[PDB]
Design a protein around this nucleic acid. Structure first.
Lengths: 50, 145, 122, 122, 186
RNA sequence: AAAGCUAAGUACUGGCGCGAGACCGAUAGCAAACAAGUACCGUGAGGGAAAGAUGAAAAGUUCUUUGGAAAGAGAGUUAAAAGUGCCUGAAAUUGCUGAAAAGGAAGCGAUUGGGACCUUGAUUCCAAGAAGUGCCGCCGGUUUGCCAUCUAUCCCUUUGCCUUCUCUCUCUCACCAGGUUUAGGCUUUGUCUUGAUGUAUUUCCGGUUCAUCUUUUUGGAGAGGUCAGCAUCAGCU
RNA sequence: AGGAGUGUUCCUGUUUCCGAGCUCGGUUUCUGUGAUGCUGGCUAUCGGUUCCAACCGACGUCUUGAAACACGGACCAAGGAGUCUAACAUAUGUGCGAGUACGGGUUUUACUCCUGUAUGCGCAAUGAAAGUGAAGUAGGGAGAUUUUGCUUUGCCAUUCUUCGCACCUACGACCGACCACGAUCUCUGAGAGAGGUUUGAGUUGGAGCAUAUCUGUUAGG
RNA sequence: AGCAAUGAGUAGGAAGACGUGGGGAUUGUGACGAAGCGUUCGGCGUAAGCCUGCGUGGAACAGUCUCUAGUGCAGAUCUUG
C-alpha cells in the first residue's frame, strides 16, 4: 500500500505516476483541541446571556 | 436526476409553466437562425455584430502546418530546461543552451523579463523585442531551420 | 408531558366537490381553476389549508393520552424506549405475529413502557 | 480520532438510526438516552459510555465504557470495558463516582437513567 | 393593513450559509464563526464570509503576485482565502510565510525549499486569533473568460465586450457592423 | 494512366447457435405469453383482433330426494369450495334488510344540538408470604491494567552511510558516478506501546448461598383525572 | 397564574420614628419580583366516529368580462402529455492547477487497475493578406498598524500616518492594423528617435481544464 | 432559545416536504398468516399523506440513507373495457 499511495507529508507515490495523497484544508481535524487551547481562549471575551 | 427538474414540481399546475395566454405552440418565430434578416434583426445588431457580409480574400485548400508557429515567451525559457540554473548562475564561463524546438516551440517573443545569466537561445524565429532583451541579458541568438 | 391541548380545527379539509363526484376522492388538492370559488375565497364554501392552522410546537404529534407514539417491530427495538418511556407510547406494528406480540408485550412490561395496541391478538 | 469529523460522516446515516415522524433514536450500547447527537452517541465521540441492564436475563446493570484518553482505540476487544452493578439506590453512589471520572458532563442524565433502570427481569 | 414597501420582511442578497458538503470546510467555518462572534476583531468576520464564497471568488493567486503584495511587508503572514499556484516565470521564489486553503504541489515544493512556511487556516488561529499583523489578500474576481463577455453587449457603441462566437478569424463576425465599408461601424 | 489478382483489421434489426439485463409484467412487452399473421373484413392490392392463473393431488361432487330436463335440497371430497371464463375479487351499477330524511331539486360551508355507536385508591410508599432473578464475596480456570516507572517509532533533526528503485537536458558520455522520489537495513539528537508493579474488571463451570430488584395477594399510610363554584391578584376593557 | 422547596440576605413598594440639611441616611413589622387559595359533583360524565335536524350563509376553459341563452363534461375502473441525444452559455458542487483529460498492458473477464505517443481546449493577440507580435500612476476602498472619545480588562470612533487587497472611476505606457514622419548604418533591408479628434473581441507578473446537476437557446417525432 | 415587525394573490419564479416502480447499502416483518381489498374501532399531520383495531385473504413485503425513472389525473367531441 505504501508503494502505491506514497508518503502523505511533496514528492510523488512511485507506482501511480505523478500522484500525491490528498491534503485537508485543516491540519488538525477537530475544533475542541484548537478552540480550547490557551492561545485562543485568553483573547476570547467572557461570553454573554440573551 | 429527473427528480430534480421543474416539471416534477410544476406537475399539478395546468399551464405547465408556459402561461395560459400565449401557450406552448410548436414553432413560433421560425426554425433555427431563420428570420435573422428581418424579424430577428434587433437581436443580431448587438450580441452578434458583423454577422452578415464577406470580407477577406478566400484561400483555396488552406493547409495548416504551413502556417503553424507555436510561441514561447522570453519570461518563460528557464522553465524550459532547475539544475542548469544553479550551474549557469556560477562559473562566468560556458552558458546553458536553450534549444526551444526540443520542448516544441518555434518563435520567441519577449513579453517578459529574464534574469541576467548568460544564455544562448536557438529558435526558428525571434521577435524584434525578444532579441533586444536577450542581448541585454548577455545572451546570444542562434537560428535553426 | 400531557400539557394542555388546543387544535384550531377538528374537521378535515375535504376536496372541493368530493361529495358530488365519486371519481374525485376526498384527499385535498388546491383548486387551480381560473374561475374557481374555493381558491378565490368566497364565503360559504370549502376552507383552504393555510399554515395559520398549524398546531403548537410543544404539542405536535401528541396523542390524547399525553404521549408521542413511536411504532416498533422487534423485541430489540423497545429497549430504545427505556429512558423515554414517560414521553413515548409504543405502537406494535401492523404485521407482527401472535407469538412475537406476546414476546414484545411481555418484554415491554419488564421495562415499564406503555403499549398502545393491547389485547392485540388473542 | 476527531469526534466532530467522524460525526460529519455518520450523523445522517448509520446502521442504528431508527425514525418515525420527527423522532429519531439510536440503538447502540455506548449511549445514554438513545438520541442521535454528537454528545450522547457511541460511534463518534471520544470516551462514550452506556448504562444497560446486563444481558444475563437482565438481573443486573452494566456500566459499559472505553479506556480513557482513547488508549486501545484500534483494538475493539481490548477497548470496551464493563462493570457489573446491583440494582439499588445504594449502588447509585458507586455508579455516580465511576461516571464523573470518565465524563463529568453526563452525570445528571446518568442519575436520571440509573433511577429508571433499577425498576427494570426476563 | 400597512403602507409598507414589500411589507418587509426584506431579505439579504448575499449567501447565508455554507453550500459544501466537504466536512473539513464546514469545520473550518465552525471555528471561524466561534472566532468571529466571540473575539470582536473584524479580520475574523471577513475571513468567515470569504470562506463561504463560491469557487469563482476563491480564485488562484500566483506565487509571483503574492511576492509583490508582500514586498515591503516581509515579516507579516500572507493570508489568502483561496488557492495558491506556482508561477513558472518566477525563477527564484521568495520565502514568505503564507496561509491559504490549498497549495498546488509545485508551490508547496517551491516555498518549503526556499525557506518558507506553508500554513493551513486552523494553524493560523493558534498563532494569530485576532489577525494581529496579518495581510488579507484576494485574487482578482473579474479576470476570466466568462467575464470578458459581460457589460454593454458587443454591438453597442463603445463596448469592449467579447461576442459569443463559435470560431476565430475572418468569416466570423467581421463584416456588417465591424467595418464602415459594410453598412456601419459601431 | 488508358490491362489484371490479393488475406487481415471493418460492417451485420436476416439465417443459425450461445450468454446477459438498475428493461416490460397480460389495456404493458412484438400485432401475436394460448390451434397469431390465427379468427374475421375486403373483388383485390391489402386490413387484422380478442383470448394467461381451480387444486399439492381431479380427490371434478357417486349416493337419497323433487323435476320433463336443466338445476335445486340433503349428504360427500378437500387445508378451503377454491365448484369448471373456477386465485385475490375494487368501483360504477342492481335486489333485499335495517336506519333515517323529503310542501316545485339535492349536495355543500360555519355553529351547536339530537339519535345510534365507540371509549376511560393513577403514580407510588411501608410491612409479611410465595413465585422469579440468581450480583459481589469465597475457590479453581481466564482476560483486561488505574498509577508510579523504564522504553520503542510516529514525526522532524540531520548525521555516518550502504542497498534497490525512480526522475533528471548532472558529468568524458556509448558506460559508471552525482543529485531528485520511493522503500528497506542502520544512525547522532530532543495527547493511538511494549515488557515488569497489580487500583480495578470481564468471562467460565462446580458452587458456598446470599444480596438485589421484578411481578403478584394481604394489610397499613397516601388520589389522580375531568367539569364546575366562590375568592385574591396581573393585563386589556 | 399551578412538579417541588426553603425566605426574604439583596431589590422595589407600602410603615414604626430616629437623626442630618420638601431632600438623603439608619432601623422595625407587613407584601411583591419568589401568590395559587379553599371546596364540591362523576369515577359515568367529559370526549370521539357516524347519520340527521335547525338559524345564517352558499349560482374545466378562452376572455376586459362566465352561474350564463359561450364550448367540453351520463357514471366507474385502468391507460394518458416538457422526454432522450447533440452544440453552446451562465450559475453552483468536486478534483487537479499553467496546466488539464482511439489504443495497448492486466483481469474473476461489458466492472476495476495501470500506462507509452499524440491531439483537444488553455498558456497571446492582430491584420483581407504578405506578415508582425505586449511603466505604471491617481481617487474611493476590505483589512492590519499607530493613536484620540465612553460603565471598568470592552465598546465605537474616521483621531492619526503606515501599507492599502479585490473592484469601480480617471489617465497613461507597450503590441497588431490604418495614417504620417526618419538621425544613421552591413542601404531589395535594418533603425536611434518622435507622433496621430483613428482602430482591436489587445496588454499590464497568467486561470484554465475535466467532471456532476439545474436553467436557457437551437436542431431533431 | 429569545425579541420585534410582518402575513391577499392569476401568469410566472424560487424554497422545504408528501407519495409511486426499480438499483446499491443497512435494519427488519411473514403459513401461529405477507401483499391487496373493505370498514361509524380509531389516532396523527396546516396539507400532500402516514400509523393502526376488526373482517376477508393465502405468499411474499416494509423502515432508514443514497442512486435511478416509462413516477402522482376530473376534464383532452381523450383511449380500452
Amino acid at each position: 500500500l505504501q508503494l502505491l499511495f506514497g508518503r502523505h507529508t511533496t514528492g510523488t507515490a512511485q507506482l501511480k505516476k505523478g500522484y500525491h495523497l490528498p491534503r485537508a484544508l485543516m491540519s488538525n481535524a477537530d475544533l475542541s483541541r484548537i478552540v480550547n487551547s490557551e492561545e485562543i481562549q485568553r483573547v476570547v471575551r467572557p461570553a454573554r446571556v440573551a | 436526476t429527473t427528480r430534480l427538474r421543474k416539471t416534477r414540481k410544476r406537475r399539478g399546475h395546468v399551464s405547465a409553466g408556459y402561461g395560459r395566454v400565449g401557450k406552448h405552440r410548436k414553432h413560433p418565430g421560425g426554425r433555427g437562425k431563420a428570420g435573422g434578416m428581418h424579424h430577428m434583426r434587433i437581436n443580431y445588431d448587438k450580441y452578434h455584430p458583423g454577422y452578415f457580409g464577406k470580407v477577406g480574400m478566400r484561400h483555396y485548400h488552406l493547409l495548416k502546418n504551413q502556417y503553424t508557429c507555436p510561441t514561447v515567451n522570453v519570461d518563460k525559457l528557464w522553465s524550459l530546461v532547475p539544475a542548469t540554473l544553479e550551474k549557469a548562475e556560477q562559473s562566468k564561463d560556458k552558458a546553458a543552451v536553450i534549444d526551444v524546438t526540443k520542448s516544441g516551440y518555434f518563435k520567441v517573443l519577449g513579453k517578459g523579463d529574464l534574469p541576467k545569466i548568460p544564455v544562448i537561445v536557438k529558435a526558428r524565429f525571434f521577435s524584434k523585442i525578444a532579441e533586444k532583451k536577450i542581448k541585454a541579458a548577455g545572451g546570444a541568438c542562434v537560428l535553426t531551420g | 408531558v400531557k400539557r394542555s391541548i388546543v387544535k384550531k380545527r377538528v374537521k378535515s379539509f375535504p376536496r372541493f366537490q368530493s361529495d358530488r363526484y365519486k371519481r374525485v376522492k376526498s384527499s385535498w388538492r388546491k383548486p387551480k381553476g381560473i374561475d374557481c370559488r374555493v381558491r378565490r375565497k368566497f364565503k360559504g364554501t370549502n376552507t383552504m389549508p393555510n399554515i395559520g392552522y398549524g398546531s403548537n410546537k410543544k404539542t405536535r404529534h401528541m396523542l390524547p393520552n399525553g404521549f408521542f407514539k413511536f411504532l416498533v417491530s422487534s423485541p430489540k427495538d423497545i429497549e430504545l424506549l427505556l429512558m423515554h418511556n414517560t414521553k413515548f407510547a409504543a405502537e406494535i406494528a401492523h404485521n407482527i405475529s401472535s407469538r412475537k406480540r406476546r414476546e414484545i408485550l411481555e418484554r415491554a412490561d419488564q421495562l415499564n413502557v406503555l403499549v398502545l395496541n393491547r389485547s392485540a391478538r388473542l | 480520532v476527531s469526534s466532530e469529523l467522524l460525526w460529519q460522516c455518520v450523523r445522517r446515516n448509520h446502521c442504528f438510526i431508527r425514525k418515525f415522524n420527527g423522532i429519531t433514536l439510536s440503538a447502540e450500547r455506548m449511549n445514554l438516552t438513545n438520541k442521535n447527537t454528537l454528545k450522547y452517541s457511541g460511534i463518534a465521540h471520544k470516551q462514550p459510555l452506556g448504562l444497560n441492564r446486563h444481558g444475563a436475563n437482565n438481573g443486573c446493570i452494566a456500566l459499559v465504557t472505553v479506556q480513557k484518553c482513547s488508549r486501545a482505540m484500534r483494538k475493539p476487544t481490548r477497548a470496551v470495558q464493563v462493570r457489573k452493578f446491583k440494582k439499588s439506590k445504594k449502588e447509585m453512589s458507586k455508579v455516580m463516582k465511576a461516571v464523573a471520572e470518565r465524563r463529568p458532563d453526563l452525570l445528571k442524565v446518568a442519575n436520571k437513567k440509573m433511577k429508571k433502570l433499577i425498576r427494570t427481569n426476563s | 393593513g400597512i403602507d409598507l414597501e414589500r411589507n418587509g420582511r426584506k431579505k439579504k442578497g448575499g449567501r447565508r450559509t455554507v453550500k459544501s458538503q466537504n466536512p473539513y470546510l464546514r469545520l473550518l467555518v465552525k471555528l471561524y464563526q466561534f472566532l468571529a462572534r466571540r473575539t470582536n476583531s473584524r479580520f475574523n468576520a471577513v475571513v468567515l464570509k470569504r470562506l463561504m464564497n463560491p469557487k469563482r471568488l476563491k480564485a488562484p493567486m500566483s506565487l509571483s503576485k503574492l511576492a509583490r503584495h508582500m514586498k515591503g511587508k516581509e515579516d507579516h503572514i500572507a493570508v489568502l482565502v483561496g488557492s495558491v499556484t506556482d508561477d513558472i516565470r518566477m525563477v527564484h521564489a521568495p520565502k514568505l510565510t503564507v496561509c491559504a486553503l490549498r497549495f498546488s504541489e509545485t508551490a508547496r515544493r517551491r516555498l518549503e525549499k526556499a525557506g518558507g512556511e506553508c500554513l493551513t487556516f486552523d494553524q493560523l488561529a493558534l498563532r494569530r486569533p485576532k489577525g494581529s499583523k496579518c495581510v488579507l489578500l484576494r485574487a482578482a474576481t473579474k479576470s476570466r473568460e466568462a467575464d470578458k463577455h459581460f457589460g454593454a453587449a458587443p454591438g453597442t457603441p463603445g463596448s469592449k465586450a467579447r461576442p459569443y462566437v463559435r470560431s476565430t478569424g475572418r468569416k466570423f463576425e467581421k463584416a456588417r457592423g465591424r467595418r464602415k465599408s459594410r453598412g456601419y461601424k459601431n
